[PDB]
Amino acid sequence: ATVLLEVPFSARGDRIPDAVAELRTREPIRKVRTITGAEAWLVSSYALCTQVLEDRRFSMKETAAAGAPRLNALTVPPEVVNNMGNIADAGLRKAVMKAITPKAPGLEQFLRDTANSLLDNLITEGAPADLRNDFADPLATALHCKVLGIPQEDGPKLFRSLSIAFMSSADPIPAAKINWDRDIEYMAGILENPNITTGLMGELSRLRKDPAYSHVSDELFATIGVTFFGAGVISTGSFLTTALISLIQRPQLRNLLHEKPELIPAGVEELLRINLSFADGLPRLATADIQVGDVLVRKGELVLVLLEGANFDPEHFPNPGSIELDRPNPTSHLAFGRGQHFCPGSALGRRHAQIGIEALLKKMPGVDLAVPIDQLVWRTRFQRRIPERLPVLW
Numbered sequence: 001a002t003v004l005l006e007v008p009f010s011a012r013g014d015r016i017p018d019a020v021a022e023l024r025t026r027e028p029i030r031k032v033r034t035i036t037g038a039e040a041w042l043v044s045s046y047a048l049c050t051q052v053l054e055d056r057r058f059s060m061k062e063t064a065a066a067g068a069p070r071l072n073a074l075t076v077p078p079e080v081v082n083n084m085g086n087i088a089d090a091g092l093r094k095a096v097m098k099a100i101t102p103k104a105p106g107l108e109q110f111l112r113d114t115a116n117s118l119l120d121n122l123i124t125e126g127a128p129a130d131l132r133n134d135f136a137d138p139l140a141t142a143l144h145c146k147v148l149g150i151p152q153e154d155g156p157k158l159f160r161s162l163s164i165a166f167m168s169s170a171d172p173i174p175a176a177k178i179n180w181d182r183d184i185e186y187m188a189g190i191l192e193n194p195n196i197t198t199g200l201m202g203e204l205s206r207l208r209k210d211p212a213y214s215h216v217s218d219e220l221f222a223t224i225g226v227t228f229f230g231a232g233v234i235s236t237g238s239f240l241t242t243a244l245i246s247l248i249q250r251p252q253l254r255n256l257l258h259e260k261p262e263l264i265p266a267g268v269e270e271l272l273r274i275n276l277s278f279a280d281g282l283p284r285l286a287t288a289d290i291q292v293g294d295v296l297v298r299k300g301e302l303v304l305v306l307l308e309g310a311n312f313d314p315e316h317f318p319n320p321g322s323i324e325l326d327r328p329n330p331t332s333h334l335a336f337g338r339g340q341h342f343c344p345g346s347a348l349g350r351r352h353a354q355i356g357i358e359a360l361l362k363k364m365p366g367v368d369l370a371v372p373i374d375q376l377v378w379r380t381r382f383q384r385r386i387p388e389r390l391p392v393l394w
C-alpha cells in the first residue's frame with residue numbers, strides 16, 4: 001500500500017520532474033494530497049488548465065472560506081485573498097494598473113541604471129558573486145520602491161517580511177501576522193506622509209482625499225501597498241533568479257542574446273514559459289459540480305492548476321523543454337495565469353527581466369555558475385522555488 005500522491009513533487013526550480021509528463025499523459029486531472037492533509041484535483045494539461053482558469057465558477061475568492069480544503073494556510077486576512085475583486089469594487093482598478101506600467105517616464109532608465117550599478121559593484125568586489133541576494137532581489141526591490149513612490153531605503157525593511165509572507169505552510173504562521181500588521185502600519189504612514197506624491201502610493205494618497213473615493217476604507221489603501229509590493233518583489237526576484245540559471249546553463253542562447261539583444265524579449269518569453277518559480281498549482285474552489293476531462297469535480301472541492309503542466313504540454317508547445325525563439329504561439333504560456341486573475345503586473349515583470357538580463361549579458365558576458373548546479377540550495381515550503389544563493393563567476 002501507498003499513500004495518496006503528495007504535492008508538491010519537488011522544490012527544485014532548475015528541472016521539471018519526469019513525473020509531470022507521466023501525469024499529464026495518463027491522468028491530466030487527478031486527486032492528490034496537499035501539505036495540510038486536504039485532497040485536491042491536480043490539473044496538469046494545457047487544455048484542462050486553461051478550462052479551469054477561464055471558468056470563474058472555480059473561485060479564487062472561495063479558497064479563503066472557513067472549512068474549505070486548503071492547499072496551505074492563509075498568510076493574509078481572508079478578505080485579502082479577494083484583493084483584485086476589492087480593488088475593482090473600490091473603482092481603483094484602472095488607477096492601479098496605470099501606476100504599474102513599465103512605461104512611466106524614466107522608469108526603464110532607472111532599471112537599467114540600477115542593474116548596471118549592482119553589476120559594477122559585484123565586478124568590483126570580485127567573483128564569486130551571489131546573483132540572487134546581490135542582483136536579482138535588490139533589482140526587484142529598487143524597482144518596486146520606485147513604482148510605489150516610497151523611499152529606496154525603506155525597501156530592505158519591507159523585503160525582510162517576504163521569506164515568511166510567501167511561505168507555503170500547513171499551519172498559520174505567527175510571524176506572518178506580526179509582519180503583516182507592521183507592513184500595514186508602514187503603508188498607512190505612507191498615505192499620511194506629505195512627501196509621497198509619486199507612483200502608486202502617491203496616486204492612492206490623492207484618490208483617498210478625492211470625494212469620489214471617500215467611502216473606500218483606509219485598510220484597503222494600505223493593503224494595496226503591502227500586497228503589490230510583496231507580490232511584485234517576490235515574483236520578479238524569483239523569476240529573474242531562476243531565469244538566470246536557465247540562461248547560464250545554455251551558453252549558446254546566452255551568446256546569441258549577447259550578440260543579438262533585440263532577441264532578448266523573445267528570450268524572456270521562452271524563459272517565462274519554462275519557468276518553475278511557482279511552487280504550487282494555482283488554487284481554486286469549485287462553486288458548482290463541473291466536468292473537467294474524465295472527472296466531475298464536486299462543489300466545495302479544491303483544484304490545483306499546475307502552471308508547468310500547461311507550459312511543458314507538448315500538445316501545445318512542441319519540444320516543450322527546448323527554448324525556441326521562433327515559436328508561433330510564444331506568449332500563449334500560463335506564466336502570468338489566465339482569465340479573471342491574469343497577473344496585473346505582467347508588463348512590469350517582463351521589463352524587469354529583459355533589462356536585468358540585458359545588463360547581465362553586457363557587463364558579464366562570461367557569466368557561469370561558480371558551483372556544480374546540484375550545490376544550489378532550494379527553498380522549501382514556499383510559494384516560489386528559488387535557490388538560497390546563486391553563486392557565479394565571469
Ligand code: HEM
Binds near residue numbers: 229236335343345
Ligand atoms: C515575472 C513576474 C511575475 C510572474 C511570473 C507573475 C505570476 C502571476 C500569476 C501566475 C498570477 C495568477 C495568480 C492566480 O491566478 O491564482 C499572478 C497574479 C497577481 N500578480 Fe503577478 N506575476 C509576476 C509579477 C507581478 C508584478 C510585477 C506584480 C505587481 C506589482 C504582480 C501582482 C499580482 C497580483 C496583485 C495578482 C493577483 C491577481 C488577482 O487576484 O486577480 N505580479 N501573478
Ligand SMILES: Oc1ccc(-c2cnnn2-c2ccc(O)cc2)cc1
Binds near residue numbers: 074080083226228
Ligand atoms: O495580492 C496578493 C498579494 C500577496 C498575497 C499573499 C498571499 N500569501 N501571502 N501573501 C502576502 C504576504 C505578505 C505580504 O506582504 C504580501 C502578500 C495574496 C494576494
